[PDB]
């Protein structure tokens, strides 16, 4: 799609390979199918389905779509930078002292039985 | 689920209260409605409204096939032999009760209420046959027998003068938690050969048995 | 009114019979935290 | 006149009370004008005391401390502890989480047209530099950025018999050893069945004032 | 022509974003917060959401001292 | 056995609790004795047990001795003897400001009684004295007992605005045609678990709705009929001699 | 058993369809070197078996499609179904 | 290409639709897209306070005493056992009021939730057991990190995995 090239133009990336637009459009189709599918399930849920209790009539307001998307981003879609979590977590790590030692001009390795000894693997 | 309580007795064990039997009733109903959902969807995707046996046997598509074929035609193994050999016995009509459960499945005659109690609003333009009703009877019976086996297994894995009012004839084996653990166990996810996409993220899938 | 810990130990004593006794301070805390996160997300 | 030091902040910045006084008498915990008292509740005050045995202000003081004091009460704190077995004081400082909290409570007003990610970012480029006009930017020569004095080493050698040898530090934990730490009056409990065991002064002291 | 280049300034948005915030961190924070709040000076710094017209993304604040 | 539904003449609980007190050596828990004696019958079969534990020997535990005294002091309050209520309290209480205010209150001058309660709580609140869990249910409840004996009904209006319970329904109610709609729904939040007091609020607003024609007559006859039968059940739970 | 299975991989009697060179490349990609030949043939074999399993899934799901009791093509519906029945995710292609 | 691209885009009749999308959308009171305000507004407790234009039913006034009580519970991971009903109920009321609902949780929710929980954890530990031994052993933290590297679809990311990669301490310390 030419409009996908137009959207590429926003990020200064005019060097595509022409498989990307097919692929990303396929992707968005898949994604929105799933989205407005489970939103339709939730529109059914407000319409109180089981093995025969009532009908199924579709409106699909925006709230249902919002629900169907928040569930997806519950386990996907790299969220806002979780800075505070990382700050406190890293303060918990950044708490116990350095070793304050001298291996005296070499490399200090972990002890063997934590080192690997990359021999030819064998039974 | 009087038939299920009889079927639960047929497997091995006795004395479920109403709780476990209503729960098992819900279990079987859910399994079966899912089966018919999938089979109807597949047929209509092939482009036919009538529900058929070829889809449903392939819907199981597993060692689940040899036993089902025998049930239609009429209309490991050492353990099932050894346990039955241990059972061999008589009196107070010992072998007699065994038969009751075999010929009191929903497919025996009561096909109508078995069809109606489960979902039937689906496929309003068509209506399935009684052959599939008998089939479902087979599947429901096998499911009840399996669930009971796992419940007993987990139960076992857990491990003065008489006052004459305790009858010494009452036992309490089976309850909600046992069946729940068993039905977790049976949802062994897939053989795990169907969840090999090991390093990723996200998941969803339905399952039977 | 009514006349007034063995949940995890029962959750794990019934998994295996060859010991496999987990350690607190390293493993158990992980699991408790996972459970907490699960309940919070679900009820939300 | 650089003053971004640790011990000097306590030695010089002294003899004035913008502080928060603590109070201890071996059973309760208190600070400031507190109507109530805190017992040995490890859910809270041990989280506090963990920090205060170090020199970090916890992240959470800031917003109440800000709305309470309009001035002459911030930048850092010192805490006034006094036992009843003396009086003692010791200093606490920021951690970059306190500083990020100093940006949060600014977000409860003017959430729109505020260019948050821009303005509240560039704010730190000025603040962080301004807090710290004492950095130690001074090199020193290694054996690696000159020549004629590259040293010798004898750990990564080649024995004639054995293949090669290396340097690998030394624990005391062996194999098949103990893994880690452990997994962790009923007459009175029977004799206390069905036991189930100053706000109304607050709403009357206002009316007695009126 | 260039009118469309000048117009193409969409600035799309999502609907909802996640925020990675566990129970433990915010719980300790809020706990110590209301402790100090009741000690020095509900009265804490809280949001206000209406039972209706929710589903929005930012809400106002009480800011009661 | 649900309500262990005897609730009849010399029944099982009365005959079991009065058989315990005749044998020394067993010492049934005091808040169960208070519950069994009040709910079924045999009040005086319960004071035989809650005085046997208090006096005589000591039980060699402070937390069994204080839970006995609280179980005793709401038996005396239920049977409305105050002279044994106010004499068990000041035998027990530890401050001086509450041994003064309890004794200025069973005499009956309620102006020097309330002053010694607000001067009792300021002996607390960062005072060094520990003051107990009970003796703090005496300060905040007999400040509001004397402040409603003295008829200060505007001060404890704004007090009961904040907590919010039957005390708001009682003082703001009687001290109903124009403010009926806030009063009617606030009754029905507390009209469950009914008592002989709460039916008088339910009946009276059904009567002043009949005055404006909002409520029909017949309903006040049914509301007075089913309410009297609850007043009957509280009379039958009391001892035989009229006190 | 198991020990026969590495008695057998060594000689030419059982040499997986996947050539030794390609598996060596894919071992190396995901980071594994060893101067044994058994193990590489074995991972070859397991992969061969897994693809055979999706093969039979496709065969049967094609056999259901019409006339239970211009040649065969394993199309996107057959694949959509079998890959789905696994854990392989949804194939929702499109046009326009 | 850019000029020719815009000309070809004008070749389609959607040049008019392209010409109209010049404004700033989200014609609402707002949809902020920043970070810090998302965080803060997703950190403070909310309060479901209600209007009353003509009548807002429910017959049970909204409170935020419940939210404070919910955030104050001795939640899991301090204690050594999965929470019994009461704790979980106290925590939920808090979350429901904090999101903008009203009415009390009805004592069946807690139990189904416990059920799903213990099922979850049995799955996880079964995975780790499938790691360590093929067919007297004892399990560690590293095996659980291994299995949460293999199978991460089990746990939702955030909060704990980052915390998991900050507890892997070395032997001497």
> Are E61 and E47 a contacting pair, CB within 8 Å?
yes
Q: Would you call C37 an interface residue with chain E, using a CB distance cutoff of 8 Å?
A: yes
Distance of CA E58 to the CA centre of its chain: 5
List all residues 6 or more positions away from A54 whose beta carbon is below 8 Å from its beta carbon: A47, A48
The technique is cryo-EM
Contact D60, A84 (CB under 8 A): no
User: Is some CB atom of chain A closer than 8 A to the CB atom of B32?
Assistant: no
Between chains, do A75 and H157 touch, taking CB under 8 Å as contact? Answer: yes
Q: What is the DSSP string of A105-119?
A: SS--BPPTTTS---P
Q: Which helix (H) or strand (E) holds E32?
A: helix E23-40
Residue D91's beta-bridge partner residues?
D78
Resolution to 1 decimal, in Å?
Answer: 3.8
Q: Does E45 contact H at CB distance below 8 Å?
A: yes
**Residues of chain H neighbouring A5 (CB-CB closer than 8 A):** 5
d(CA B13, CA E64): 65
Q: Residue H40 and residue D171: Cβ atoms within 8 Å?
A: no
CB-based contact F138:F93 (threshold 8 Å): yes
**List of E strands, D5-56:** 20-24, 29-31
Residue A29 near residue G94, CB atoms below 8 Å: yes
Main-chain phi, psi angles of H30, to 5 degrees:
155, 160
Pairing type for strands D77-82 and D20-24 reads parallel
Closest-CA distance of chain D to residue C21, Å:
9
CB neighbours of residue F77 within 10 Å: 12
Contact B158 C14 (CB under 8 A): yes
DSSP-based helix, strand, coil % in chain D, nearest 5: 30, 10, 60
Give the residue extent of every domain in chain G: 1-96
F132: which residues sit within 8 A by CB, 6+ positions away? F66, F94
Rg, Å, chain H Cα set: 26
- G88 vs B: CB within 8 A: yes
From the number of C-beta atoms within 10 Å of its C-beta (0-12, 13-18, 19+), residue B58 rates as: middle
Q: Which residues of H touch A76 (CB under 8 A)?
A: none
Q: Taking CA atoms, what residue in H is nearest to B199?
A: H150
* Chain H interface test: which of C5, C9, C35 (most H C-beta within 10 Å): C35
- Nearest chain B residue to A71 by CA: give it: B202
How far apart are the CA of B149 and the nearest CA of chain C, in angstroms? 17
Q: List the single best residue of H93, H149, H160 to mutate versus C (max C Cβ within 10 A).
A: H160
- Min CA distance, C41 vs chain D (Å)? 23
Please judge whether H115 and B199 are an interchain contact, meaning their C-beta atoms are less than 8 angstroms apart. Answer: no
Residue of chain A nearest E15, judged by CA positions: A66
Of B119, F154, H154, H173, nearest to A99 by C-alpha is H173
Provide the b/e sequence for A92-106 (b: ≥16 CB within 10 Å).
eeeeeeeeeeeeeee
Number of domains chain A contains: 1
Among the partner-chain residues H2, H9, H162, the one whose CB lies closest to the CB of A85 is H162
List subunits contacting chain G, requiring 3 or more Cβ pairs under 8 Å: A, B
DSSP secondary structure of F58-101:
--S-HHHHHHHHHHHHHHHTTTT--TTHHHHHTTT---SHHHHH
D93: alpha, beta or left, given left = phi > 0 and alpha = psi -120 to 50?
A: beta
Number of H helices, E strands in chain F: 13, 0
CA distance B122 to chain H (A): 29
E3–H19 C-beta distance less than 8 A = yes
Q: How far is CA E55 from the centre of its chain?
A: 12
Note whether F touches G: 3 CB pairs or more under 8 A.
no
Nearest to H157 by CA among D4, F116, A77: A77
Q: Do D153 and A88 touch (CB under 8 A)?
A: no
Probe site for chain A from G40, G42, G94, G96 (most A CB atoms < 10 A): G94
Phi-psi region of D193 (alpha: psi -120 to 50; beta: other; left: phi over 0): beta
Q: What order of strands is seen across the sheet that includes strand D20-24?
A: D29-31, D20-24, D77-82, D87-92
Phi, psi of D55 (to 5 degrees): -120, 35
Hey, is the C-beta of H153 within 8 angstroms of any chain B C-beta? yes
Q: How far is G66 from chain A (nearest CA, A)?
A: 28
CA D185 to chain C, closest CA, distance in angstroms equals 14
Write out the residue range of the structural domain in which residue A58 sits.
1-123
Beta strands in G1-96 (DSSP E): none
Euclidean distance between CA atoms A2 and H15, whole angstroms? 13
Phi-psi region of B123 (alpha: psi -120 to 50; beta: other; left: phi over 0): left
Query: How many angstroms separate the CA atoms of E9 and H21, rounded?
Result: 8
* Rounded CA Rg of chain E: 20
Per DSSP, the three-state class of C3 is coil
Q: Which helix (H) or strand (E) holds D78?
A: strand D77-82
């Amino acid at each position: 799609v030419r409009l996908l090239h137009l959207i590429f133009a926003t990020q200064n990336i005019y060097s595509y390979q022409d498989h990307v637009p097919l692929q990303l459009m396929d992707f968005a189709y898949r994604y929105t199918t799933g989205t407005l599918q489970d939103a339709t399930i939730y529109s059914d849920h407000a319409h109180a389905s089981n093995a025969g209790n009532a009908g199924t009539n579709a409106q699909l307001t925006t709230e249902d779509i919002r629900l169907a998307i928040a569930a997806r981003t519950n386990y996907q879609f790299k969220p806002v930078p979780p800075k505070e979590l990382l700050l406190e977590l890293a303060a918990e790590r950044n708490k116990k002292p350095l070793p304050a030692v001298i291996p005296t001009w070499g490399i200090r390795l972990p002890p063997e039985k934590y080192c690997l000894t990359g021999k030819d693997w064998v039974l | 689920m009087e038939i299920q309580q009889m079927m639960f007795v047929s497997g091995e064990t006795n004395d479920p209260p109403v709780e476990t039997t209503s729960l098992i009733e819900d279990i079987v109903r859910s399994q079966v409605v899912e089966i018919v959902l999938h089979s109807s969807q597949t047929a209509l995707s092939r482009g036919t409204k009538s529900i058929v046996p070829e889809d449903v046997i392939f819907l199981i598509r597993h060692d689940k096939a040899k036993v089902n074929r025998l049930r239609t035609y009429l209309s490991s193994l050492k353990r099932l032999k050894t346990n039955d050999e241990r059972t061999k016995n008589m009196t107070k009509e010992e072998y007699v009760h065994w038969s009751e459960c075999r010929q009191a499945s929903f497919t025996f005659r009561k096909a109508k209420r078995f069809r109606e109690w489960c979902g039937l609003s689906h496929l309003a333009e068509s209506r399935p046959s009684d052959d599939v009703i008998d089939i479902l009877g087979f599947l429901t019976f096998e499911m009840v027998c399996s669930i009971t086996e796992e419940a007993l297994i987990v139960k076992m894995l857990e491990e003065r003068k008489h006052l004459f009012d305790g009858p010494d004839k009452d036992v309490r084996p089976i309850t909600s938690g046992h069946v729940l653990e068993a039905w977790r166990r049976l949802q062994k996810r897939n053989v795990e050969k169907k969840a090999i996409r090991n390093f990723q993220g996200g998941k969803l899938r339905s399952r039977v048995q | 009114s009514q006349p007034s810990l063995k949940e995890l130990l029962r959750n794990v004593g019934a998994d295996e019979g060859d010991g496999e006794t987990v350690i607190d301070g390293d493993v158990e805390e992980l699991l408790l935290d996972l459970a907490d996160e699960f309940v919070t997300s679900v009820t939300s | 006149k650089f003053a971004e030091t640790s011990e000097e902040i306590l030695h010089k910045y002294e003899k004035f009370p913008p502080s928060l006084t603590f109070h201890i008498h071996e059973n309760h915990y208190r600070f400031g004008d507190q109507d109530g008292v805190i017992p040995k509740n490890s859910s809270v005050i041990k989280a506090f005391l963990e920090y205060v045995a170090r020199e970090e202000i916890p992240p959470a003081l800031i917003e109440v401390t800000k709305d309470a004091g309009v001035q002459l009460y911030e930048g850092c704190i010192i805490l006034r502890i006094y036992d009843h077995r003396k009086t003692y004081t010791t200093i606490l400082r920021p951690t970059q989480l306190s500083l990020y909290a100093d940006l949060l409570y600014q977000t409860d007003y003017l959430q729109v047209r505020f260019t948050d990610s821009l303005s509240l970012n560039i704010e730190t480029e000025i603040l962080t530099a301004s807090k710290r006009n004492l950095d130690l930017s001074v090199p020193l020569n290694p054996h690696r950025a000159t020549a004629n004095l590259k040293p010798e080493v004898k750990y990564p050698y080649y024995d004639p018999e054995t293949d090669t040898v290396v340097h690998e530090h030394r624990p005391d934990a062996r194999g098949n050893m103990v893994n880690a730490d452990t997994v962790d009056s009923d007459y009175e409990r029977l004799m206390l069945l069905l036991s189930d065991r100053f706000m109304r002064l607050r709403f009357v002291e206002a009316w007695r004032k009126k | 022509h260039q009118v469309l280049d000048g117009v193409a300034k969409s600035y799309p948005l999502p609907l909802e974003r996640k925020v990675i915030m566990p129970a433990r961190s915010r719980s300790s924070f809020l706990r110590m917060r209301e402790m100090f709040a009741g000690a020095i000076l509900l009265y804490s710094r809280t949001a206000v959401i209406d039972v209706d017209r929710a589903g929005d993304y930012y809400f106002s604040v009480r800011a009661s001292p | 056995y649900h309500i262990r539904q005897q609730d009849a003449r010399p029944n099982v609980i009365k005959s079991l609790l009065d058989g315990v007190g005749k044998c020394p050596g067993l010492h049934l828990p005091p808040h169960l004795v208070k519950y069994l004696g009040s709910n079924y019958n045999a009040w005086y079969g319960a004071i035989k047990l809650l005085e046997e534990l208090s006096e005589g020997q000591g039980i060699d535990n402070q937390k069994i001795s204080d839970a006995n005294q609280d179980a005793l002091l709401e038996v005396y309050m239920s049977l409305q003897e105050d002279d044994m209520f106010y004499g068990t309290w000041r035998r027990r209480a530890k401050y001086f400001e509450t041994n003064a205010a309890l004794s200025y209150e069973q005499i009956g001058i309620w102006d020097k009684a309330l002053q010694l309660y607000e001067a009792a709580q300021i002996k607390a609140r960062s005072g060094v004295f520990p003051f107990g869990e009970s003796e703090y249910s005496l300060w905040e409840d007999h400040w509001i007992y004397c402040a409603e004996k003295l008829q200060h009904w505007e001060i404890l209006t704004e007090l009961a605005k904040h907590e919010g319970f039957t005390d708001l329904l009682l003082e703001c109610g009687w001290r109903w045609i124009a403010d009926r709609e806030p009063l009617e729904q606030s009754v029905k939040t507390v009209m469950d678990i009914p008592t002989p007091r709460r039916q008088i609020f339910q009946t009276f607003l059904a009567l002043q709705g009949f005055s404006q024609q909002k409520d029909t007559l017949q309903d006040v006859s049914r509301l007075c009929d089913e309410g009297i039968q609850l007043t009957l059940r509280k009379w039958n739970a009391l001892p035989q001699r009229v006190t | 058993t198991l020990e026969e299975i590495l008695e057998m991989m060594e000689d030419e009697e059982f040499t997986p369809i996947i050539p030794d060179a390609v598996t060596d490349y894919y071992l190396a990609k995901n980071g594994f070197e060893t101067s044994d030949i058994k193990i590489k043939r074995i991972l070859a074999l397991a992969t061969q078996k897994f693809i055979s399993d999706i093969a039979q899934d496709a065969y049967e799901y094609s056999r259901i499609r019409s006339s239970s009791s211009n040649k065969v093509v394993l199309t996107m519906d057959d694949l959509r179904s079998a890959l789905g029945e696994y854990g392989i995710n949804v194939k929702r292609p499109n046009f326009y | 290409y850019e000029r020719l691209k815009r000309d070809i885009l004008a070749l389609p009749v959607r040049e008019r639709r392209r010409i109209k999308a010049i404004t700033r959308e989200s014609g609402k009171k707002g949809m902020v897209n920043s970070v810090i305000t998302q965080t803060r507004q997703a950190l403070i407790p909310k309060v479901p306070v209600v209007t009353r234009p003509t009548n807002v039913p429910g017959n049970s006034v909204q409170w935020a005493q419940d939210v404070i009580h919910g955030f104050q519970a001795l939640l899991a991971s301090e204690i050594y056992e999965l929470p019994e009903m009461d704790n979980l109920r106290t925590r939920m009321t808090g979350i429901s009021r904090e999101h903008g609902l009203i009415g009390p949780v009805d004592d069946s929710v807690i139990e189904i939730m416990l059920i799903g929980l213990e099922q979850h954890l049995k799955g996880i530990v079964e995975a780790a057991i499938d790691i360590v031994k093929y067919r007297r052993h004892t399990l560690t933290i590293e095996d659980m990190y291994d299995t949460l590297e293999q199978y991460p679809y089990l746990v939702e990311p955030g909060g704990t995995l980052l915390r998991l990669q900050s507890v892997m301490l070395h032997d001497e310390d």
